[PDB]
Short mmCIF file of C-alpha atoms and ligand atoms in Angstrom, two decimals:
data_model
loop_
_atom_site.label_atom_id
_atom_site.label_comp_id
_atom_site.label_asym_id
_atom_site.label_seq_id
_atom_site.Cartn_x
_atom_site.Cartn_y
_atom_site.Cartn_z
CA UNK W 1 0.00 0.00 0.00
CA UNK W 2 0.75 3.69 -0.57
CA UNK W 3 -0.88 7.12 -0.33
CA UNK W 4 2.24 9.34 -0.68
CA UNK W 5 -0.81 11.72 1.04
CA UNK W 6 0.25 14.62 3.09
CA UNK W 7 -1.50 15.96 6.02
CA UNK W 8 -0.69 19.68 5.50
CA UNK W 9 2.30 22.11 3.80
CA UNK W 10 4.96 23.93 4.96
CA UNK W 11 6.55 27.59 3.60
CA UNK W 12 10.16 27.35 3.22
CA UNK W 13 11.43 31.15 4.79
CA UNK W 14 14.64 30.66 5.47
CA UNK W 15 17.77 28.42 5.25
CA UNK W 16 20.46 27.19 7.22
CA UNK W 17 23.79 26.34 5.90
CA UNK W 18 26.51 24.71 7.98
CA UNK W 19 29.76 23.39 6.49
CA UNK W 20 28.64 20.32 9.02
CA UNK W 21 25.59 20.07 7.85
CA UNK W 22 22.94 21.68 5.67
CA UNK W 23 19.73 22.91 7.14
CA UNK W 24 16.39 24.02 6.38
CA UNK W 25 13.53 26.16 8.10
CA UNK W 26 9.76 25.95 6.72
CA UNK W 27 6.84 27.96 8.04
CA UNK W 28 4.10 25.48 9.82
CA UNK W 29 0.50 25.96 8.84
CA UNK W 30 -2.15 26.63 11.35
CA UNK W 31 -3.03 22.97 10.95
CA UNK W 32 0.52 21.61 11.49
CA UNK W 33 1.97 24.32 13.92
CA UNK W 34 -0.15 22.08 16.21
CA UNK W 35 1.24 18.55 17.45
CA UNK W 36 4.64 19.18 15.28
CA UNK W 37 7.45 19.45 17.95
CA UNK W 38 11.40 19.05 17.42
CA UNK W 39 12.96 15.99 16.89
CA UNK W 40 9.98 14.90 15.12
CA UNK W 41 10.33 13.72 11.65
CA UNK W 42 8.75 15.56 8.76
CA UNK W 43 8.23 13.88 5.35
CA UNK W 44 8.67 17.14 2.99
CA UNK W 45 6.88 15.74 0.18
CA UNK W 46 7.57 12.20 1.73
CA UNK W 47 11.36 12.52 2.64
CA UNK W 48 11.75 11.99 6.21
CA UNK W 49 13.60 14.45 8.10
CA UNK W 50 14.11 15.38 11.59
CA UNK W 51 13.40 18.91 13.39
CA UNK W 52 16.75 20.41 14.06
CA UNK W 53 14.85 23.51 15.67
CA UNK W 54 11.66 25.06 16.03
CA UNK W 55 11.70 28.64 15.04
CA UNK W 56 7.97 29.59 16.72
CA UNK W 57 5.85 28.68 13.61
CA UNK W 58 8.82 27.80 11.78
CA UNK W 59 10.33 24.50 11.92
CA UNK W 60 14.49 23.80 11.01
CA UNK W 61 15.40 20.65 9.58
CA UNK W 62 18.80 18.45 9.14
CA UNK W 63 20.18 17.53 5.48
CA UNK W 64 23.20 15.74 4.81
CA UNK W 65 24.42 18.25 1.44
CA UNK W 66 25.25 14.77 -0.35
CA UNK W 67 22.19 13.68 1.22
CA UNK W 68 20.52 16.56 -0.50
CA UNK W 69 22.45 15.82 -4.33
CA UNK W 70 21.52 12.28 -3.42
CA UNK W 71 17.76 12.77 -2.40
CA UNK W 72 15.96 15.68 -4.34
CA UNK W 73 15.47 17.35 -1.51
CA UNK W 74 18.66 19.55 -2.73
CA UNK W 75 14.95 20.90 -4.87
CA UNK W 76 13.64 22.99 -2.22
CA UNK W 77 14.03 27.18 -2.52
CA UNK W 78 12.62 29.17 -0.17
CA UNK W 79 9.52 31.39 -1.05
CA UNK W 80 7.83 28.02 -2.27
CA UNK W 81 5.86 25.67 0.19
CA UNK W 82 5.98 22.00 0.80
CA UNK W 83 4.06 18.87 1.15
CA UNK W 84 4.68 18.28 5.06
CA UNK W 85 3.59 15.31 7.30
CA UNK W 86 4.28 14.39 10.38
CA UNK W 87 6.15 10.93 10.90
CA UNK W 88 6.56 9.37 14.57
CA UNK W 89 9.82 7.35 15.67
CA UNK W 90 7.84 4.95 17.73
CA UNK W 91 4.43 4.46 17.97
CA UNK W 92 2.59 1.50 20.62
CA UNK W 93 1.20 0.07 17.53
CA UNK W 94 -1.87 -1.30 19.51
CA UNK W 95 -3.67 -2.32 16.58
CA UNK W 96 -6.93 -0.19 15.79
CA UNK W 97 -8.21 -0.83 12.55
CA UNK M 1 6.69 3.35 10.50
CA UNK M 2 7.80 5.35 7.54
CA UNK M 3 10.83 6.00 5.51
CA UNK M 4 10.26 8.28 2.78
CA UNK M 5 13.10 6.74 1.09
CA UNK M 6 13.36 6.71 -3.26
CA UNK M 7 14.49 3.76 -5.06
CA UNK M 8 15.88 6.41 -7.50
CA UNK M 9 15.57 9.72 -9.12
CA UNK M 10 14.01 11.16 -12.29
CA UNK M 11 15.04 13.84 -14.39
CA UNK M 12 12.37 16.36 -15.48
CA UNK M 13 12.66 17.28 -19.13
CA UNK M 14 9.29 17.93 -20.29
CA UNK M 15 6.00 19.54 -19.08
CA UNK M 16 2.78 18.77 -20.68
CA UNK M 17 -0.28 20.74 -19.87
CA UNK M 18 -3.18 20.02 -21.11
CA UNK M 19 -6.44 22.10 -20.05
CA UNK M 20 -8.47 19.39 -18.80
CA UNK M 21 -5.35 18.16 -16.77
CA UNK M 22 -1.13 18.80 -16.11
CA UNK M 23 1.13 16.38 -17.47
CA UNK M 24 4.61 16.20 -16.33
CA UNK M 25 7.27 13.61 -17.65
CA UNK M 26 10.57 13.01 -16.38
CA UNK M 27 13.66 11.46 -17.61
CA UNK M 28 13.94 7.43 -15.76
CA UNK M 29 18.06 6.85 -14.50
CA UNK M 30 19.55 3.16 -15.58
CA UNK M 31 17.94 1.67 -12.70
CA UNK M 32 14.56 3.29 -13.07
CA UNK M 33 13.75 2.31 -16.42
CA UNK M 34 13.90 -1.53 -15.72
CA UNK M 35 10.43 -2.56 -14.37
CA UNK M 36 8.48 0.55 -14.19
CA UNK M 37 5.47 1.13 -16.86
CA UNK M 38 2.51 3.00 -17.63
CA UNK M 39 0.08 3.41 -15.21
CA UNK M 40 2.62 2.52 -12.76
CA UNK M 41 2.21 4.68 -9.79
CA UNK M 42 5.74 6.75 -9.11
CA UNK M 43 5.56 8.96 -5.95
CA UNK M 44 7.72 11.85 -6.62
CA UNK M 45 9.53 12.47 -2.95
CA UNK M 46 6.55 10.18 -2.08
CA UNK M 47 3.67 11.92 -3.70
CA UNK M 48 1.89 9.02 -5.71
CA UNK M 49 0.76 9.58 -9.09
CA UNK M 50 0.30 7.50 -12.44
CA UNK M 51 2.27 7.09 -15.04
CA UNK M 52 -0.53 8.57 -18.53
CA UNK M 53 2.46 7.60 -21.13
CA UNK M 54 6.28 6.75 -21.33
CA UNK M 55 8.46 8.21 -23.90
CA UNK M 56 10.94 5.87 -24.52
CA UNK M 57 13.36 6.23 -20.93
CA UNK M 58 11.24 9.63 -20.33
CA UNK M 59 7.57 8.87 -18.21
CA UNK M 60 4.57 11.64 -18.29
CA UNK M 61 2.45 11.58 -15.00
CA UNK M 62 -0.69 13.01 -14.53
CA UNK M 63 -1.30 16.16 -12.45
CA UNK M 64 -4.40 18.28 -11.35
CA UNK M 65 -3.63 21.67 -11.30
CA UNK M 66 -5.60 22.19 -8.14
CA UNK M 67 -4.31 18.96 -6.97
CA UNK M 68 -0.79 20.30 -7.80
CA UNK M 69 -1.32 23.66 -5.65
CA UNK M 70 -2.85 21.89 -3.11
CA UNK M 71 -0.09 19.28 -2.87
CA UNK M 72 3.46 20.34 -3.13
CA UNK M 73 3.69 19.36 -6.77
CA UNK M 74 3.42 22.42 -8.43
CA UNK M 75 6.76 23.12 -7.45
CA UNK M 76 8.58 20.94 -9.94
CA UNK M 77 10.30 22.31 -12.47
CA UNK M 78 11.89 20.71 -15.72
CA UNK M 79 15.76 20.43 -15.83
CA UNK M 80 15.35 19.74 -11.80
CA UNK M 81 15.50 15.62 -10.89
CA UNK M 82 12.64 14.03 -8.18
CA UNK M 83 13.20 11.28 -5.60
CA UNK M 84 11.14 8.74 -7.99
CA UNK M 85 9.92 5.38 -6.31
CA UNK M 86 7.72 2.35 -7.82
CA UNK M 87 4.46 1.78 -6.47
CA UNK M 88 1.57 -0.87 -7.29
CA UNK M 89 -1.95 -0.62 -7.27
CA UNK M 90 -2.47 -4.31 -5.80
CA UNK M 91 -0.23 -6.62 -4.47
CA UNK M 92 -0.74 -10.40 -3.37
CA UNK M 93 1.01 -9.58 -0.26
CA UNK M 94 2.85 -6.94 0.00
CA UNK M 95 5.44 -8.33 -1.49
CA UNK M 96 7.75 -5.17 -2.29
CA UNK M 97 10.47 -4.06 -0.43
C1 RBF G 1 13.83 7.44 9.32
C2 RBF G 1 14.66 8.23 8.34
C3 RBF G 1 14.98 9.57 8.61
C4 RBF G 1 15.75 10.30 7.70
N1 RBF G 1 16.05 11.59 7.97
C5 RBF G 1 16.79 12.34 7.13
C6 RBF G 1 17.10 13.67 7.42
O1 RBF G 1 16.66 14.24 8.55
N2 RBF G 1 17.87 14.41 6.53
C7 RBF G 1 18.32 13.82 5.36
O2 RBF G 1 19.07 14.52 4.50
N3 RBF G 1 18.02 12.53 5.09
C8 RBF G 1 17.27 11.79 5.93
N4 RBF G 1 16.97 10.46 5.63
C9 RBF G 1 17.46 9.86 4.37
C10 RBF G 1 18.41 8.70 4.68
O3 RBF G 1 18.85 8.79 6.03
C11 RBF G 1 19.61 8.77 3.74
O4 RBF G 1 20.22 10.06 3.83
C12 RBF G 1 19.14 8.53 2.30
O5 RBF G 1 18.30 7.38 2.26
C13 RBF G 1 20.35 8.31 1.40
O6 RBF G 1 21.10 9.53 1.30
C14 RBF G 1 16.20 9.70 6.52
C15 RBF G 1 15.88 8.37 6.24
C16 RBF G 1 15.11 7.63 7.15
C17 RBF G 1 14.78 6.19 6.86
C1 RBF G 2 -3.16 6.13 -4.78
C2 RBF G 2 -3.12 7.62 -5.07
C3 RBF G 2 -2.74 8.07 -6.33
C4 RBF G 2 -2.70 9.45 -6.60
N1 RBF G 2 -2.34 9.88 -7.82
C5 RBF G 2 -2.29 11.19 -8.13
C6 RBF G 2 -1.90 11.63 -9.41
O1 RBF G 2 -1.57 10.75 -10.35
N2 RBF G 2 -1.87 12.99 -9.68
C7 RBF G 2 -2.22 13.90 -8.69
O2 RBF G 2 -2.20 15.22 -8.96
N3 RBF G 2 -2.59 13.47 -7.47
C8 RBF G 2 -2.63 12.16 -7.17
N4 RBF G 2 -3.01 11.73 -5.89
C9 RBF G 2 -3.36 12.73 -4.86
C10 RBF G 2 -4.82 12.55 -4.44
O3 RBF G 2 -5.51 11.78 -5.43
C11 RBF G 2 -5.48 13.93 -4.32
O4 RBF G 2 -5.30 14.65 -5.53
C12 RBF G 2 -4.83 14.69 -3.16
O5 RBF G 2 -4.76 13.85 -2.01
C13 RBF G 2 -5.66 15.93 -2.84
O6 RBF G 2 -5.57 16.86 -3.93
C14 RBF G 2 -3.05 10.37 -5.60
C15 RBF G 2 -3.43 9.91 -4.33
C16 RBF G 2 -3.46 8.53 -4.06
C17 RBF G 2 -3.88 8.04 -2.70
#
């Protein structure tokens, strides 16, 4: 199975570049500026990613810059929004339905 | 669980747009264009859409243009490569890693 469906977007307003590592900041949604915290991982589009920082609204993510060549996340500019979900580390995984 | 994480990329090289719906082909790397076909669905960074026609290595997907502003798809744009994965409509069990 696959849905590749996103629960909200994100406006990329700034980035963060460290020789280390690259990073990038997004502007959270009304819907997703709720329940989003760092260390969480965002799918941008479906790309998993972790919160570096939380900038209020904003949110800071990690990318490896090879990572980035490798992926096509290197894609992203700011001014333009993404397709942002929220992704869990671990989960109970009860069962539900 | 989640991963977000592409088989491959895909190079876009041509946009068709058509007024009844947006059609957007990219270019499929050496290890793309083995197995995939048309109405395949390839998530783009993990957004799932079908394949409407391949030409030759190069694959169209359909696109609504509201669909593409309200996802994050509108942002592609040709001469850029996506984070391209295979998807299938049914399985017998799963059976894809
Ligand atoms: C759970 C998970 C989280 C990931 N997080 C990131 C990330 O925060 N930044 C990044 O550039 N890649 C991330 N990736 C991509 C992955 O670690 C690796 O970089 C690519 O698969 C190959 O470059 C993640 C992959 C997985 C499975
Ligand atoms: C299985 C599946 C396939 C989808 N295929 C496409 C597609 O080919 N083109 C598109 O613009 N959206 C596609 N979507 C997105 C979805 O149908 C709908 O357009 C968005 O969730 C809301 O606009 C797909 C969603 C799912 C779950």
């Amino acid at each position: 199975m696959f849905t590749g469906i996103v629960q909200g977007t994100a406006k990329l307003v700034s980035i963060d570049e460290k020789p280390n590592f690259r990073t990038h900041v997004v502007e959270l949604p009304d819907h997703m500026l709720d329940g989003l915290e760092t260390g969480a991982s965002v799918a941008h589009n479906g790309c998993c990613l972790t919160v570096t920082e939380i900038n209020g609204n904003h949110v800071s993510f990690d990318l490896m810059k090879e990572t980035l060549r490798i992926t096509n996340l290197g894609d992203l500019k700011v001014g333009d929004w993404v397709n942002v979900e929220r992704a869990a580390k671990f989960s109970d995984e009860i069962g539900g339905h």
